[PDB]
Write a protein that binds this ligand. Sequence first.
Ligand SMILES: *[C@@H]1O[C@H](CO)[C@@H](O[C@@H]2O[C@H](CO)[C@@H](O[C@@H]3O[C@H](CO)[C@@H](O)[C@H](O)[C@@H]3O)[C@H](O)[C@H]2NC(C)=O)[C@H](O)[C@H]1NC(C)=O
Ligand SMILES: *[C@@H]1O[C@H](CO)[C@@H](O[C@@H]2O[C@H](CO)[C@@H](O[C@@H]3O[C@H](CO)[C@@H](O)[C@H](O)[C@@H]3O)[C@H](O)[C@H]2NC(C)=O)[C@H](O)[C@H]1NC(C)=O
Ligand SMILES: *[C@@H]1O[C@H](CO)[C@@H](O[C@@H]2O[C@H](CO)[C@@H](O[C@@H]3O[C@H](CO)[C@@H](O)[C@H](O)[C@@H]3O)[C@H](O)[C@H]2NC(C)=O)[C@H](O)[C@H]1NC(C)=O
Ligand SMILES: *[C@@H]1O[C@H](CO)[C@@H](O[C@@H]2O[C@H](CO)[C@@H](O)[C@H](O)[C@H]2NC(C)=O)[C@H](O)[C@H]1NC(C)=O
Ligand SMILES: *[C@@H]1O[C@H](CO)[C@@H](O[C@@H]2O[C@H](CO)[C@@H](O)[C@H](O)[C@H]2NC(C)=O)[C@H](O)[C@H]1NC(C)=O
Ligand SMILES: *[C@@H]1O[C@H](CO)[C@@H](O[C@@H]2O[C@H](CO)[C@@H](O)[C@H](O)[C@H]2NC(C)=O)[C@H](O)[C@H]1NC(C)=O
Ligand SMILES: *[C@@H]1O[C@H](CO)[C@@H](O[C@@H]2O[C@H](CO)[C@@H](O)[C@H](O)[C@H]2NC(C)=O)[C@H](O)[C@H]1NC(C)=O
Ligand SMILES: *[C@@H]1O[C@H](CO)[C@@H](O[C@@H]2O[C@H](CO)[C@@H](O)[C@H](O)[C@H]2NC(C)=O)[C@H](O)[C@H]1NC(C)=O
Ligand SMILES: *[C@@H]1O[C@H](CO)[C@@H](O[C@@H]2O[C@H](CO)[C@@H](O)[C@H](O)[C@H]2NC(C)=O)[C@H](O)[C@H]1NC(C)=O
Lengths: 148, 148, 148, 147, 147, 147
Amino acid sequence: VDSVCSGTLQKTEDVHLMGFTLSGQKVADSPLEASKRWAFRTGVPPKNVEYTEGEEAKTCYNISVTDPSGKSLLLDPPSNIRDYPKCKTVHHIQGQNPHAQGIALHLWGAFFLYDRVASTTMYRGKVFTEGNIAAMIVNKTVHRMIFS
Amino acid sequence: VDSVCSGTLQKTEDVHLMGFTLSGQKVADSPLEASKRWAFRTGVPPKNVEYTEGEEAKTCYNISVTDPSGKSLLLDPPSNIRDYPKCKTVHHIQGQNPHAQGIALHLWGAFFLYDRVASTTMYRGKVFTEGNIAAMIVNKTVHRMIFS
Amino acid sequence: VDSVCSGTLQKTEDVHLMGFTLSGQKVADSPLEASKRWAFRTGVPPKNVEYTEGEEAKTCYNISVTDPSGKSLLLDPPSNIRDYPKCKTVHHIQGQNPHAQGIALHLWGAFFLYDRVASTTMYRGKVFTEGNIAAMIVNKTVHRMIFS
Amino acid sequence: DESPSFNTSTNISLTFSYFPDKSGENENDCDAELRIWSVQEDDLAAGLSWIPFFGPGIEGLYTAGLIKNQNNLVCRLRRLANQTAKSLELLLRVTTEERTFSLINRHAIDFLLTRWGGTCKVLGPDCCIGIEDLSKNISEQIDKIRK
Amino acid sequence: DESPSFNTSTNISLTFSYFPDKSGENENDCDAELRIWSVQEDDLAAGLSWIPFFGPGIEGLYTAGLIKNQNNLVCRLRRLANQTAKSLELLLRVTTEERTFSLINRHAIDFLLTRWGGTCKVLGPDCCIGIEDLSKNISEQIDKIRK
Amino acid sequence: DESPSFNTSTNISLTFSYFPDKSGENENDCDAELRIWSVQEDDLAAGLSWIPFFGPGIEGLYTAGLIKNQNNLVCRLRRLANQTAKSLELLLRVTTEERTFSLINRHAIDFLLTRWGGTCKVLGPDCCIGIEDLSKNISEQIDKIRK
Ligand SMILES: *[C@@H]1O[C@H](CO)[C@@H](O[C@@H]2O[C@H](CO)[C@@H](O[C@@H]3O[C@H](CO)[C@@H](O)[C@H](O)[C@@H]3O)[C@H](O)[C@H]2NC(C)=O)[C@H](O)[C@H]1NC(C)=O
Ligand SMILES: *[C@@H]1O[C@H](CO)[C@@H](O[C@@H]2O[C@H](CO)[C@@H](O[C@@H]3O[C@H](CO)[C@@H](O)[C@H](O)[C@@H]3O)[C@H](O)[C@H]2NC(C)=O)[C@H](O)[C@H]1NC(C)=O
Ligand SMILES: *[C@@H]1O[C@H](CO)[C@@H](O[C@@H]2O[C@H](CO)[C@@H](O[C@@H]3O[C@H](CO)[C@@H](O)[C@H](O)[C@@H]3O)[C@H](O)[C@H]2NC(C)=O)[C@H](O)[C@H]1NC(C)=O
Ligand SMILES: *[C@@H]1O[C@H](CO)[C@@H](O[C@@H]2O[C@H](CO)[C@@H](O)[C@H](O)[C@H]2NC(C)=O)[C@H](O)[C@H]1NC(C)=O
Ligand SMILES: *[C@@H]1O[C@H](CO)[C@@H](O[C@@H]2O[C@H](CO)[C@@H](O)[C@H](O)[C@H]2NC(C)=O)[C@H](O)[C@H]1NC(C)=O
Ligand SMILES: *[C@@H]1O[C@H](CO)[C@@H](O[C@@H]2O[C@H](CO)[C@@H](O)[C@H](O)[C@H]2NC(C)=O)[C@H](O)[C@H]1NC(C)=O
Ligand SMILES: *[C@@H]1O[C@H](CO)[C@@H](O[C@@H]2O[C@H](CO)[C@@H](O)[C@H](O)[C@H]2NC(C)=O)[C@H](O)[C@H]1NC(C)=O
Ligand SMILES: *[C@@H]1O[C@H](CO)[C@@H](O[C@@H]2O[C@H](CO)[C@@H](O)[C@H](O)[C@H]2NC(C)=O)[C@H](O)[C@H]1NC(C)=O
Ligand SMILES: *[C@@H]1O[C@H](CO)[C@@H](O[C@@H]2O[C@H](CO)[C@@H](O)[C@H](O)[C@H]2NC(C)=O)[C@H](O)[C@H]1NC(C)=O
């Protein structure tokens, strides 16, 4: 129904934020292609946001990037950053950048997805996949049937 | 009254989360007994949750446990972890475990209680007591009479 | 209108917390005067609170204070503490205290204002201004006209 | 159902709306005495008490209270804590944030959601609305029809 | 409008209230198959499962589900995520807290604000209130007037 | 009472619902001029502005606004901040979390709690409900009784 009143939210638990991948959006995810969407920049503070469920990822990345001196250009992961839950193929990459400064920011405005945490930046050594999230109401009964 | 509408919540301040001890639940709290409820494990991320008031504790523990090499098996306390407010008797314990790995998790699913913070794990060097918390509505007028 | 129902809040975004300075409250802000309102103390845990908009500051301070041994008496700034957004004149001060202990607490109960964060204490090396905050409802339409 | 409430009587008579009967619970496995602590929320008792600097500090921070087992409520409180645990652990499992968790704001929201997430059926169970003054006005209108 | 809902039918028939038609969206730029993961919210399946210690741990932490493209909803879900992004980035710009953000509590509050921030005009658009039982009682009162 | 609101007129006429008269407050201890800053919430002004990477950065992050003392509101705003302080410090005393605090979400919840925590008495003070269209429909029903 198109009405504002259509829909019921009984507990906060029934708000579900789902992470959908860019691979699921038929976007090229090869490491060489994927990296063309990532870029370094200063003056931007990385932000993180919690979500509840996510799509099984086609591909993920486990990346460490430094400057020539060996100092990471990627931020150390916060306590609450865990490797993405379900990746079919992880791309482990470790290297250095000759002339880059700041932090890794996704170009499309998409998020770096980890385990129930989306971010505007790439965390060093943590498994992630690219994606976006969407909010919806799912009651427990509906939730129980899907996941079981 | 048994009705959903029974009860009024005027401000968020009127939600009170009280910490009740296991000693108050006539549970053996001697250090040798108490420790039989604590155990080490990996793969579990410690969680913390804020509460508002608590019972004066009968006994508390100030514990540090490491591995043989001297590295703590207990997590360093976060900024917001303070010693439990009111302990009648504190049990200071410091030692090492020959073959244990991970973090200290309460077996009963009870919480490690500190100063207005409940946790699924034991923090190194902080005074705690075991307990559970309960939620209720208390207006300021009711609150003022009790605590005064 | 004086009624409880007077006023509408459609999104949480429409709650605005504005930071007003003490200089805007015709309070002496010269470094030598300003510092008479700051004092060190133990047993108090510094608290921070987020706000949304603030007044352009007349004067700000960028302060570092240690003990004689060189150890800072001011707390290291948390990830989310950024220099105050708009200061007309910053007072950079760096020195030591012969016999002081604890953290810097504002005497008036006013807040140390940074970039969208108010605090009960002074953070080492971060630009701040003194002030208080106020809560109000501003819809986007009203907001768009002001800031543009 | 809904966050239980803790009222005063109808010194210090207390009422606690939660009964575990609504769970095999009988007799006593709890201490009737319940001494408790809360952060000093006093209003200008020392005048400058609100200011952090002039605040008591961690040592004098707490205030003490006592709750007696007038209607076996303490034990019900005690039991309640024991049962809250499971749901609370499950809640936390889902959360990724380790540092803290505002259970307080969660309960406040859930309180509202239960009474306003849905749609109201006037004079019906599970919804709060008062019609005594509306129906009285309907009746007052019918009284105005005279002559 | 309001957080879309995801209902079951009227196995596993699913309904998704969001349509991008309410944006030039047609055909398909998404996979019909949607396999997903969620944290085990099972109720005492292992009996002691709720307890962290007896919990599965990060490896066995997740449960798997499948959503089919019955009404092209998956793609609508997929599209929805793509559009949510902009507002979500702008939201985060404003926030100073980097560590986390409870978008979940924000949506819950905004849901309530939309339906209760304002003032109600009985039997009107944008407000939820039910008058079927109130007007039936008005009608029942008029029936009681007999003799 | 309730979070004050800041409306526009009935350029840039402004209305501020808070009056300290509802506190010995008279004359002026504040600057009429009020220049302020807010985070750029512009909608695609640069097209790609929403994206963090293409965002201005901390230096160009802020937007500037001006509020004039048309009805001495600025000083009332100013005073309001001064008085908010005490309650705000007391609030924070209770909190254990040091890192941050979402006062914003707290106010949003308290707003709702005041207008919906309790139970409504139709057409009564302290509750928001609209009966003009309901009573008009009651009147329209009585008009339908004709013949
Ligand atoms: C994702 O990639 C990172 C590397 O970029 C992997 O992290 C690596 O994890 C192992 C095990 O924790 C670390 O090995 C140990 O390091 C310590 C020193 O810290 C050393 O004393 C031990 O002997 C051992 O070698 C390794 O250093 C760490 N690397 C970094 C740079 O942090 C991570 O495991 C990958 N994730 C997955 C799912 O494969
Ligand atoms: C709870 O037990 C812990 C020990 O497990 C007690 O912590 C101890 O606190 C004192 C005072 O802060 C520390 O002493 C000082 O340590 C520094 C080095 O960090 C040293 O330079 C000083 O000369 C002095 O000895 C002590 O190290 C610390 N121990 C640990 C392991 O952190 C704590 O005080 C107990 N709580 C209560 C309420 O008694
Ligand atoms: C506010 O005042 C503080 C000082 O109290 C200023 O902080 C200073 O920032 C610069 C640039 O980040 C630091 O310089 C660099 O330090 C590193 C060592 O950390 C050194 O290797 C470099 O060669 C360089 O000198 C400086 O150390 C730092 N000082 C402190 C005490 O943190 C800050 O810039 C002032 N803010 C404004 C807006 O002016
Ligand atoms: C949402 O998905 C669309 C569709 O792919 C993305 O659009 C792409 O945007 C980039 C950057 O502007 C362009 O180079 C591509 O050509 C676009 N693709 C198509 C098919 O037009 C959009 O950027 C995505 N945004 C988010 C937040 O995920
Ligand atoms: C709540 O209290 C009960 C009562 O003590 C606890 O039950 C105990 O559970 C352990 C572990 O399963 C058993 O070994 C004991 O025999 C039980 N005690 C009794 C008297 O039956 C229960 O575990 C507590 N749970 C929490 C969350 O505190
Ligand atoms: C709010 O502003 C008033 C007005 O300046 C402050 O009052 C001052 O308080 C200090 C400390 O008690 C006194 O020494 C001054 O004499 C007071 N000023 C005046 C003009 O009376 C008050 O402290 C401020 N409080 C906050 C929270 O900002
Ligand atoms: C705090 O809650 C108490 C109930 O626990 C309220 O007290 C009763 O309120 C009703 C309705 O106004 C009165 O009929 C009773 O006579 C009150 N009893 C007593 C002993 O006060 C109390 O009003 C609430 N306080 C506030 C400020 O809301
Ligand atoms: C969970 O949500 C579903 C809808 O997705 C609810 O199911 C329907 O509820 C209505 C109203 O009670 C009934 O008329 C339908 O027959 C229900 N259908 C089914 C298949 O159950 C369901 O009631 C909700 N569950 C809870 C516990 O609130
Ligand atoms: C934003 O708030 C303003 C009030 O400050 C609203 O403006 C008035 O709204 C009423 C009711 O719709 C109208 O009768 C007035 O004519 C409006 N005045 C003006 C100057 O617009 C405004 O509608 C609100 N905006 C939104 C999008 O909700």
